[PDB]
From Swiss-Prot, chain A:
PTM comment, free text: Palmitoylated via thioester bonds. These palmitoylations may induce disruption of the C-terminus transmembrane. This would result in the reorientation of E2 C-terminus from lumenal to cytoplasmic side.
Location in or out of the cell: Virion membrane; Host cell membrane
Subunit comment: Processing of the precursor of protein E3/E2 into E2 and E3 results in a heterodimer of the spike glycoproteins E2 and E1. Spike at virion surface are constituted of three E2-E1 heterodimers. Interacts with 6K protein.
Protein role: Plays a role in viral attachment to target host cell, by binding to the cell receptor. Synthesized as a p62 precursor which is processed by furin at the cell membrane just before virion budding, giving rise to E2-E1 heterodimer. The p62-E1 heterodimer is stable, whereas E2-E1 is unstable and dissociate at low pH. p62 is processed at the last step, presumably to avoid E1 fusion activation before its final export to cell surface.
Membrane topology: Single-pass type I membrane protein
UniProt-recorded name of the protein: Spike glycoprotein E2
From Swiss-Prot, chain B:
Cysteine disulfide links: C49-C114, C62-C94, C63-C96, C68-C78, C260-C272, C302-C377, C307-C381, C329-C371
Native organism: Eastern equine encephalitis virus (strain Florida 91-469) (EEEV)
Maturation and modification: N-glycosylated.
Region (E1 fusion peptide loop) residue spans: 84-101
Membrane-topology annotation of the record: Single-pass type I membrane protein
Compartment annotation: Virion membrane; Host cell membrane
Ranges in the topological domain labelled Cytoplasmic: 439-441
Name of the protein in its database record: Spike glycoprotein E1
Subunit structure: The precursor of protein E3/E2 and E1 form a heterodimer shortly after synthesis. Processing of the precursor of protein E3/E2 into E2 and E3 results in a heterodimer of the spike glycoproteins E2 and E1. Spike at virion surface are constituted of three E2-E1 heterodimers. After target cell attachment and endocytosis, E1 change conformation to form homotrimers. Interacts with 6K protein.
UniProtKB/Swiss-Prot annotation, chain C:
Protein name: Spike glycoprotein E1
Its biological purpose: Class II viral fusion protein. Fusion activity is inactive as long as E1 is bound to E2 in mature virion. After virus attachment to target cell and endocytosis, acidification of the endosome would induce dissociation of E1/E2 heterodimer and concomitant trimerization of the E1 subunits. This E1 trimer is fusion active, and promotes release of viral nucleocapsid in cytoplasm after endosome and viral membrane fusion. Efficient fusion requires the presence of cholesterol and sphingolipid in the target membrane.
Subcellular location: Virion membrane; Host cell membrane
Highest taxon listed in the record's lineage: Viruses
Post-translational modification: N-glycosylated.
Membrane topology: Single-pass type I membrane protein
Assembly mode: The precursor of protein E3/E2 and E1 form a heterodimer shortly after synthesis. Processing of the precursor of protein E3/E2 into E2 and E3 results in a heterodimer of the spike glycoproteins E2 and E1. Spike at virion surface are constituted of three E2-E1 heterodimers. After target cell attachment and endocytosis, E1 change conformation to form homotrimers. Interacts with 6K protein.
Amino acid sequence: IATLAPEPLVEHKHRTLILHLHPDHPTLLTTRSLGSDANPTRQWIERPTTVNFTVTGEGLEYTWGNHPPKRVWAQESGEGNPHGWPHEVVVYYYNRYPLTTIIGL
Amino acid sequence: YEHTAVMPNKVGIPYKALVERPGYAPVHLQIQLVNTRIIPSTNLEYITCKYKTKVPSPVVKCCGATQCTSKPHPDYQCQVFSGVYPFMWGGAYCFCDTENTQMSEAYVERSEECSIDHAKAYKVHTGTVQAMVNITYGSVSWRSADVYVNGETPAKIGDAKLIIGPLSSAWSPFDNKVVVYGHEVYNYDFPEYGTGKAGSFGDLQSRTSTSNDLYANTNLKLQRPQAGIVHTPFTQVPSGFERWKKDKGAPLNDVAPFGCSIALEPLRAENCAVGSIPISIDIPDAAFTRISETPTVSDLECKITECTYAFDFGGIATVAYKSSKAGNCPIHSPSGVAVIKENDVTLAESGSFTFHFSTANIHPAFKLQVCTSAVTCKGDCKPPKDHIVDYPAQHTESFTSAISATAWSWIKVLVGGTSAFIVLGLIATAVVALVLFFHRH
Amino acid sequence: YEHTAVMPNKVGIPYKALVERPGYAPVHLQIQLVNTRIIPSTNLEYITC
């Protein structure tokens, strides 16, 4: 019989997952992505910290302690208005596509 | 009737297709995956566990000398220490001062814990792929059976015959050499049963779990007994199985890409999502109806009431029909702009029904068929408020799906008006040569 | 569902709004104020009589 860590506080952002981890024992946190590049991270948490992970549309899977793994997918909420003046049309596609708007303009 | 197409390699989402036969009404075909296991071929090489060095009782020659023979034993050691004069309880042990012999023999044997926690060293060879496929068509319910992923083994599922084609990619998450410890696997190299660095991984190799032969190098060295007491002291480096159990990386089930969950007992790699799967299903003619039996429809007009950019089914539209007679016909959309939640419809005489769809476009120009008749739908969609969801996407994101109608008109004049202005500039040269030629004659 | 807006500082006049959750019917919302007290912090210096 092993200990169970307290569950983290989960708040969402645009393509960003924030976890508030408060452990009472040294606890392991492993994350991986469900795309072509897994990008695996691992660390031992001994103090109350906060971590930010970049969740894409392909997904992300994270385990915390002895809890079962959880999978999260990022939607396409965006931070702009696609119809209107071109001072806000451009800033809509910059957040969605920062790699094609700079090259394409 | 053979239906041949390409199914993407995904587990959760279903594949919807409408099978067209001349002279017969179309049917709705659904193919859904449940499992996708990649099973390589493995042969066990050797096992590893912590050692246990047991020493026999040394001899105490009083006035003389002793020699030893090379006994067959893993990591066997012998030595002779001269002039020991040991002391036990009840006085000294022997007469002869400053000449005596002690044996102090030691050798290495596996532990009694080797049958519980041991690391299995496997060599991986490429093998077979299999899957479990749920199948329905027409009006019969869902029923499934295990299929094989090759190009040579048909499977009898339902009344039809299904041949699941080979995978588009030969990618496998396993390396050539893997180590299985407990319930997790690792990508690790081997000392190949001949070598051993005595402290890293191969200080004790046995061919099976109960093999008589055993390889063991551990730097075991005999030490002289001190001050006239009877004991055999030795000196050796610590175990490599304990050092590997601390200096260990992440397992392959936390490292493998494409969401490959790894099981153990056939050593599969379940539910990977890579490539595509060709299909070939031969639906029998008993599920085909005629054009005369199915109703015909006309005066189809479509209006989208609400659409959303989000995942799951965020779109809902109502259509209006004028049917000849009541009955059931399937609905299907050929283009990949919108997927459809349900298959059939309970039609009536001059009514209307609503259906739910799912796009990844701001303006969906998708098109769907109802009772082998055509209609198109257009509309607008709004971005959602959710940032992170716990379910995968039901649609397919394309390249032109993100272009709004405002920005499409902006890039229709930066490439249309400018490139036609050069045409206006080029014909000025074409007409100034005609005027200058007319100056001559 | 979170719905943010700006209401005026009038007591008797209610604020009517219509929230819009996608995929769901709109729900009417009515907010009305009944009081508005500004309470400063005081320390007594002295009395006189």
